[PDB]
A and B are shown apart, each in its own frame.
Chain A
């Protein structure tokens, strides 16, 4: 994948 940003506060 070219770029990925994770939400560390998901859920």
Chain B
């Protein structure tokens, strides 16, 4: 594609939550670190343990930003400009195909914790986000 400037793409995801005050030196290539902060967030109940459909969101992707919105009321959960996105990582937990966005903060950073419906979906999200990273200059 290259309709990232003039149009938007929507994908199926689950929104687990947003982790804040995470060390800015976090390596998005590191499974152990990301899972460290995620597991810690789960023990503190800042993230849900298992995925229901109450966590069903639409991810709208464009050259301007990444937008997440609930499926119920479609109220906007968060809006992250592409230049505020440091990276996107696919972490495969057992049943959860986690897609984690390392983003800037509104030097610490934020981890947007998402869950794709499958492996190919997560890899697709990472590819699309890569293309978006590239079309913006």
Contact = CB atoms under 8 A, between A and B. Distances in A.
Interface residues of B, number: 27
B47 interface: no
A8 B86 CA distance: 8
Contacts of A2: 31, 89-92, 119, 122-123
Nearest to A7: B133
A1 B86 contact: no
Report whether over half of chain A's contact residues are helix, strand or loop; otherwise say mixed. loop
Contacts of B91: 1-2
- In which size bucket is the chain A interface? 10 to 19
Contacts of A3: 89-90, 122-123, 126
Interface of B: 28-31, 34, 82-92, 104, 119, 122-123, 126-127, 129-130, 133, 136-137
Q: Which 4 A-B pairs have the closest CB atoms?
A: A3-B90, A5-B130, A7-B133, A2-B90
